Design an enzyme around this catalytic site. Sequence first.
Site, short mmCIF file in Angstrom:
data_model
loop_
_atom_site.label_atom_id
_atom_site.label_comp_id
_atom_site.label_asym_id
_atom_site.label_seq_id
_atom_site.Cartn_x
_atom_site.Cartn_y
_atom_site.Cartn_z
N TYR A 16 0.83 -1.20 0.00
CA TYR A 16 0.00 0.00 0.00
C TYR A 16 0.87 1.26 0.00
O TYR A 16 0.61 2.21 -0.77
CB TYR A 16 -0.95 -0.03 1.21
CG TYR A 16 -1.69 1.26 1.46
CD1 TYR A 16 -2.80 1.61 0.69
CD2 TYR A 16 -1.28 2.15 2.46
CE1 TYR A 16 -3.49 2.80 0.92
CE2 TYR A 16 -1.95 3.34 2.70
CZ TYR A 16 -3.05 3.66 1.93
OH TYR A 16 -3.73 4.83 2.16
N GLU A 38 -11.07 5.05 3.73
CA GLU A 38 -10.44 5.86 4.78
C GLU A 38 -11.39 6.13 5.95
O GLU A 38 -10.98 6.10 7.11
CB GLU A 38 -9.90 7.18 4.21
CG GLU A 38 -9.01 7.95 5.17
CD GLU A 38 -7.64 7.32 5.31
OE1 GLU A 38 -6.94 7.16 4.29
OE2 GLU A 38 -7.27 6.99 6.45
N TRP A 46 -4.76 0.19 9.65
CA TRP A 46 -5.02 0.23 8.22
C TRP A 46 -4.94 -1.17 7.58
O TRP A 46 -5.75 -1.49 6.71
CB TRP A 46 -4.11 1.25 7.53
CG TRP A 46 -4.49 1.48 6.11
CD1 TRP A 46 -3.70 1.30 5.02
CD2 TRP A 46 -5.78 1.90 5.62
NE1 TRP A 46 -4.40 1.59 3.87
CE2 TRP A 46 -5.68 1.96 4.21
CE3 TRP A 46 -7.00 2.24 6.23
CZ2 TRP A 46 -6.75 2.35 3.40
CZ3 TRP A 46 -8.07 2.62 5.42
CH2 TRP A 46 -7.93 2.68 4.02
#
Length: 186
Positions: A16, A38, A46
Amino acid sequence: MNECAFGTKDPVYLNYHDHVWGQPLYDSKALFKLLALESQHAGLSWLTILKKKEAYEEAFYDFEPEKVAQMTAQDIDRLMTFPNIVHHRKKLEAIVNQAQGYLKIEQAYGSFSKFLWSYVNGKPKDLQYEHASDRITVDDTATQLSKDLKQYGFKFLGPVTVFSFLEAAGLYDAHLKDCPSKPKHN
Ligand SMILES: [Zn+2]
């Protein structure tokens, strides 16, 4: 660069960092998807969302705004037991409100991408960081954008979250000067 990627060693996260985070994203639908995901971050790592991305796609029509915007409490009721997504009702409802907000923006302004990119005058703001400790977590622009999005019905996107999104979508470039993944800006 390890420092740039928050000292995270898991290579799914590094993927990522290396191939998404901070790379200028100009496609309206892709921006919406990134923003929506998000909004699911809060109070979780995350990595948790990254491993669930494909499940979210299946839950939410591949984040196609016209389709997501039409979802109702009935859909959310179903999604509260859909495997491998986070069953936080307000987070799930928020994605629908965001899609509705996207449609309202495109009605008023034509393009969701052009709307967002206007906040940095159409080109990435290179934050010119050298150390990970240089990094801030919020600013005035992200705060105003958060407020402005709220007016179109977006939810779960406070200033700090919007700041994070700006960095993720490459409207802000927060990569360190010596990071191999820092994008070239002209
Ligand atoms: Zn980097």
